[PDB]
A paper describes a structure:
The nitrogenase Fe protein mediates ATP-dependent electron transfer to the nitrogenase MoFe protein during nitrogen fixation, in addition to catalyzing MoFe protein-independent substrate (CO2) reduction and facilitating MoFe protein metallocluster biosynthesis. The Fe protein also catalyzes MoFe protein-independent CO2-to-CO reduction, and participates in the biosynthesis of both the P-cluster and FeMo-cofactor. Unlike most Fe4S4 clusters in metalloproteins which adopt two oxidation states, the Fe protein cluster can span three oxidation states (2+/1+/0).
We initially observed Se-incorporation into the Fe protein cluster using our group’s previously reported KSeCN turnover conditions, which include KSeCN as the selenium source, dithionite as the reductant, and an ATP regenerating system. The crystal structure at 1.51 Å resolution of the Se-incorporated Fe protein isolated from this reaction mixture is shown in Figure 2. The crystal form is isomorphous to the previously reported MgADP-bound state of the Fe protein, with the Fe protein molecular twofold axis coincident with a crystallographic twofold axis so that the asymmetric unit contains one subunit and half the cluster. The unique Fe1 and Fe2 sites are coordinated to Cys 97A and Cys 132A, respectively, while the unique chalcogenide sites 3 and 4 are buried and surface exposed, respectively. Modeling the cluster exclusively as either the Fe4S4 or Fe4Se4 form resulted in substantial positive or negative difference density in the corresponding Fobs − Fcalc difference Fourier maps, respectively. The Se occupancies at the X3 and X4 positions are shown in Table 1, entry 1, with the buried X3 position exhibiting a greater extent of Se-incorporation relative to the surface exposed X4 position.
Residue numbers in the entry:
A (entry chain A), B (entry chain A): 1 to 272
Write the structure that this text describes.
């Protein structure tokens, strides 16, 4: 068995930082993990690889002729803790569909046998500002069975969480894609944890962890490292270890109950 | 003549707040303006209409049978200062293409003669986290001749500005779509204005205005109002009046020069 999880959320909310640090903590624990970047920004693996970014499947397929000329051992790269990493890539802006590379990448990984029984976790890091095209494919096509949404007290971040939840509901009759929880990535504001707990309760899920805002994140990322690797003694490292333990132990996977804009506005008014 | 401008930027950066306040200031000045919402969130006109949001062309077409059963005087709604307002709408999450409603809406407005010679400005408020589908159509199909990008010192916001600029370059051989400037919507951080000026200079454009972070914005929006209408004496009202004057007077419209990720990182490092 292997657990297939996807991290969704609005742009800039902390998906890639949270995913890479969570995965580093899982590897520290002894888990075998793959990260699949599904965001055109294509920097979802740089902290595991100590790299600028990673060359994408779309780029390598073009340089090699066809995606069939690629071998899995040519694309997948291992970094901290043995974590295996791949980036989908996507068309340049104003061309085609920004999510088209995700479809190519996930089909390539499936056909080439990247999903070896020895993997314990696969994490997809997915753009969530729109839920369409290749960015909906992990939900539509049953690839990401457990979705975790990174959000914050920001109205736009909570709106995105609600929109992603509507996409999960849309495909509830096929496959087994479910909402696993919300992850609050703090803007260090008062009662922000209580706000995201309230939102989770309204959706029918839970807030799995509250990640504090900590400058050590920037100091680690300037050096192309997770906090787990950069400063294993840091308080923030222990925060990511706590998040990873709670993901491992999580048993609540639900078809969420999206809320109205009036309910969202009332939440914000109440906690402010 | 009428000037056709589009406001792009990452989600949550301040596009709709900035556009509606800028447009209220233009109306206060005596200009005739239309706002076309091109973001699936569909709340781009609520502060002009004093409303929850606005019913969308996609919704009204479905309730009426076809878009041909709609009349322009049925969709367009006027609010503060006579500003005319319309929302595109879009498919539900996980269905189709999130930008498909923009294509329907802009074609409807063109065919029904919404672009009457007496309009002075049209503003499109466009989602910019991906530049594809209907969200690229204002650029691809020559609808938004002057693009203004709302951004901030946030790395993701500057990345989005660079991505939108790449889309402009892609279509530089057809039509006349050009980058008009960057608008800094402050996270009140030190030297943030200098950072966005530097980014504008590297792209070949200018930072047209620095909009401060001001709590009066929230107090106005809780009452479904622009700051221009809510408190015309506010310092922030004068900030939006300054932005509007500089848009009116702007003569620099360029094919931008997108930068590398290394250049972007160096900017952030330098000003921090
Ligand atoms: N908990 C945190 N504390 C401090 N900085 C953070 C935290 N989480 C994310 N960041 C920073 O926020 C920025 C955006 O995070 P990122 O994971 O790249 O967002 P996304 O992948 O959702 O676009 C990065 O500069 C990152 O260092
Ligand atoms: N200059 C500002 N000062 C204070 N709050 C602001 C300012 N600009 C935007 N906001 C707030 O930020 C939030 C997002 O702005 P919005 O215009 O809806 O973003 P977008 O349309 O880009 O998604 C809103 O709650 C708005 O009130
Ligand atoms: S939104 Fe991107 S292509 Fe449909
Ligand atoms: S990204 Fe949305 S449909 Fe192509
Ligand atoms: Mg990311
Ligand atoms: Mg908006």
């Amino acid at each position: 068995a292997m657990r297939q999880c996807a991290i969704y959320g609005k742009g800039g909310i902390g998906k890639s930082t949270t995913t890479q640090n969570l995965v580093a903590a899982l590897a520290e624990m002894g888990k075998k993990v793959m990260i699949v970047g599904c965001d055109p920004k294509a920097d979802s693996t740089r902290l595991i690889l100590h790299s600028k970014a990673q060359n994408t499947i779309m780029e390598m397929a073009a340089e090699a002729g066809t995606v069939e000329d690629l071998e899995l051992e040519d694309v997948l790269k291992a970094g901290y803790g043995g974590v295996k990493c791949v980036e989908s890539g996507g068309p340049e802006p104003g061309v085609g569909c920004a999510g088209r590379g995700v479809i190519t990448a996930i089909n390539f990984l499936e056909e080439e046998g990247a999903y070896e029984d020895d993997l314990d976790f696969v994490f997809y890091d997915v753009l969530g500002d729109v839920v369409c095209g290749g960015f909906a494919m992990p939900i539509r096509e049953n690839k990401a069975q457990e979705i975790y949404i990174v959000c914050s007290g920001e109205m736009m971040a909570m709106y995105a969480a609600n929109n992603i939840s509507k996409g999960i509901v849309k495909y509830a009759n096929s496959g087994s894609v479910r909402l696993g929880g919300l992850i609050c990535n703090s803007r260090n504001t008062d009662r922000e944890d209580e706000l995201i707990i309230a939102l989770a309760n309204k959706l029918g899920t839970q807030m799995i962890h509250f990640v504090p805002r900590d400058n050590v994140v920037q100091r680690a990322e300037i050096r192309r490292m997770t906090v787990i690797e950069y400063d294993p003694k840091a308080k923030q490292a222990d925060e990511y270890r706590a998040l990873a333990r709670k993901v491992v132990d999580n048993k609540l996977l639900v078809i969420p109950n999206p809320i109205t804009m009036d309910e969202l506005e009332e939440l914000l008014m109440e906690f402010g």
